Amino acid sequence: QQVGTQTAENHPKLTVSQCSAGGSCTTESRSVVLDSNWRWLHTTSGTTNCYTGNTWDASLCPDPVTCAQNCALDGADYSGTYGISTSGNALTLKFVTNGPYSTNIGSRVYLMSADDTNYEIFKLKNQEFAFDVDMSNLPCGLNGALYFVEMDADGGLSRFPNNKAGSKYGTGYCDTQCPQDIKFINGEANILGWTPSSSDSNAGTGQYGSCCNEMDVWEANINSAAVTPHVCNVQGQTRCSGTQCGDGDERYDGICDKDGCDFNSFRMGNQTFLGPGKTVNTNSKFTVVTQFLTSDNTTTGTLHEIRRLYVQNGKVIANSKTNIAGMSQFDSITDDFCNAQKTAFGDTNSFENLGGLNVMGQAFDKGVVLVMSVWDDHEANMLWLDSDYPTTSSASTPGVARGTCATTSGVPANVESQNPNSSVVFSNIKIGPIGSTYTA
């Protein structure tokens, strides 16, 4: 894709903290950028759209390359059109925004580096990452997600000749779902076999997907939360086609682990731990701390364990323990946990098949980009996060119940119609050595 200049691109500012042993942190000036899929895409010479609704203009986009050369991504009206605003260390993502020219549902942003051009690259091995979240305004069916993916720092500017926009315009997304709804992959418009979504009037899928390792630090709404590493057998952002993408029936045949090795306290058998008025009380803001422990306690050692702590009202709260009959008891993510939980639940262990925490840690070695988003789910209505899933399974079967929401909840049109003003606030991001990002 090309660069459009009708609208200047000014990334909303966001401060983050870099912390040291003892807990003193320095403030770093960073910013966020809107993902390219949300942007106005118009001809380089004018204002004619290359894509409208969920339909590409066939005469501007006769083929993937011509389309990438003819079509330009333009600057974004972050707050008034996309519902994205920041206030110091706080990022607010609104669910539904009505701009003067377009309505936008959900958003996805990446953290920029100090240069405000390339993404910030995080090296998470043997580090602790903390943030605060207020998801009191995120009901059933919503997901406010904070996570890392193995994107290129420049979003593909240097790898792909026909990507002339790059990370400044939020290009280069990938994750372990190998999404095929991404409009530009590898600097080419993803127009081959383009099929509009029937339920999402702004979306479609093309022949290719964009795949990479993904650490889901946080996927949650007021009801339930999950922390989930996912790995692939490829390194970095990789375009997939056919079986590689692991779409539909080929879910477990692809290059990436779609299910991941998840820890949702509710799913793991503690229904009183996280939620409205619970131990972690999601009616109010709290701190989420995530530790990426290596086997030798160095930044070069093998990733061995992902641990979780919460902090609310100044009190540290230990992670819940698993409570699945017949399964050994864990309170964190280890490869042993993943093996035990996949066995207990009868789920295919692609996480381990594709190299487990070792491979996750190798993605961390190379570096990953911070993503924050708010979304509803056209495929599964977020039931995998907050309800009984599959809905066709007995809710007494271990692993099926993930939260208290109704199996009829989370239909996008219903959630948009009923809770349009939903929002999530992510704030006070900190990274440092273990123990450095919060006060015990």
Ligand X SMILES: O[C@@H]1[C@@H](O)[C@@H](O)OC[C@H]1O
Ligand Y SMILES: *[C@@H]1O[C@H](CO)[C@@H](O[C@@H]2O[C@H](CO)[C@@H](O)[C@H](O)[C@H]2NC(C)=O)[C@H](O)[C@H]1NC(C)=O
Distance CA 129, CA 25 (A): 13
Distance CA 233, CA 426 (A): 31
CB of 1 to Mg ion, least distance (A): 10
Among 126, 167, 291, 320, binds ligand Y (CB under 6 A): 320
Residue 234's CB: how many other CB atoms inside 10 A? 18
Question: If binding is defined by CB under 5 A, does position 322 make contact with Mg ion?
Answer: no
CB of 164 to Mg ion, least distance (A): 5
CB of 331 to ligand Y, least distance (A): 9
CB of 312 to ligand Y, least distance (A): 11
Distance between alpha carbon 169 and the CA centroid of its chain, in Å? 18
Per the DSSP assignment, residues forming a β-bridge with 430 are 17, 130
Q: Give the one entry of ligand Y, ligand X, Mg ion, none that residue 228 binds, where binding means its C-beta sits below a cut-off of 5 to 8 angstroms depending on kind.
A: ligand X
Residues 138-177 close enough to bind Mg ion by CB under 5 A:
157, 163
Question: If binding is defined by CB under 6 A, does position 337 make contact with ligand Y?
Answer: no
Q: Which residue has the tokens 């377009």?
A: 102
Question: If binding is defined by CB under 5 A, does position 373 make contact with Mg ion?
Answer: no
165 vs 255, which CB is nearer to ligand X?
255
Question: If binding is defined by CB under 6 A, does position 404 make contact with ligand Y?
Answer: no
Tell me the CA distances in angstroms from 236 to 79, 109, 153, 362, 364, one per residue in order.
Answer: 31, 19, 11, 10, 11
Question: Cβ contacts of residue 244 below 8 Å, gap of 6+?
Answer: 178, 209, 211, 254, 255
Evaluate whether 286 touches 310 at the Cβ level (below 8 Å): yes
Q: Give the one entry of Mg ion, ligand Y, ligand X, none that residue 384 binds, where binding means its C-beta sits below a cut-off of 5 to 8 angstroms depending on kind.
A: ligand X
Distance CA 287, CA 131 (A): 6
Q: Which residues bind ligand X (CB under 6 A)?
A: 228, 259-260, 262, 380, 384
Question: If binding is defined by CB under 5 A, does position 118 make contact with Mg ion?
Answer: no
Q: Give the one entry of ligand X, ligand Y, Mg ion, none that residue 273 binds, where binding means its C-beta sits below a cut-off of 5 to 8 angstroms depending on kind.
A: ligand Y
Q: Give the one entry of ligand Y, ligand X, Mg ion, none that residue 323 binds, where binding means its C-beta sits below a cut-off of 5 to 8 angstroms depending on kind.
A: ligand Y
- Name the nearest CA neighbour of 404 among 267, 249, 307: 267
Question: If binding is defined by CB under 6 A, does position 282 make contact with ligand Y?
Answer: no
- Name the nearest CA neighbour of 97 among 140, 42, 34: 34
Catalytic sites, residue numbers: 214, 219
Near ligand Y by CB under 6 A, which window of 5-13, 196-204, 268-276, 301-309?
268-276
CB of 415 to ligand Y, least distance (A): 28
Distance CA 258, CA 251 (A): 7
Q: Give the one entry of ligand X, Mg ion, ligand Y, none that residue 279 binds, where binding means its C-beta sits below a cut-off of 5 to 8 angstroms depending on kind.
A: ligand Y
CA dihedral 148, 154, 159, 161 (to 10 degrees): 130
Question: If binding is defined by CB under 6 A, does position 208 make contact with ligand Y?
Answer: no
Question: If binding is defined by CB under 6 A, does position 279 make contact with ligand Y?
Answer: yes
Q: Give the one entry of ligand X, ligand Y, Mg ion, none that residue 272 binds, where binding means its C-beta sits below a cut-off of 5 to 8 angstroms depending on kind.
A: ligand Y
CB of 143 to ligand X, least distance (A): 8
177-208: burial string, b at 16+ Cβ within 10 Å, e else: bbbbbbbbbbbbbbbeebeeeeebebbbbbbb
Residue at shortest CB range from ligand Y: 270
* 195 membership: H or E segment, kind and range: strand 195-196
234 vs 309, which CB is nearer to ligand Y?
309
Q: Give the one entry of ligand X, ligand Y, Mg ion, none that residue 210 binds, where binding means its C-beta sits below a cut-off of 5 to 8 angstroms depending on kind.
A: none
Among 147, 169, 173, 273, binds ligand Y (CB under 6 A): 273
Q: What is the DSSP string of 51-120?
A: EETTEE-TTT-SSHHHHHHHEEE----TTTTT-EEEETTEEEEESEEE-SS-EEE-EEEEEE-TTSSSBP
The single-letter DSSP state of residue 232 is B
CB of 353 to ligand X, least distance (A): 16
Distance CA 249, CA 262 (A): 21
Residues near ligand Y (CB under 6 A) are 270, 272-273, 279, 320, 323
Residues near Mg ion (CB under 5 A) are 157, 163
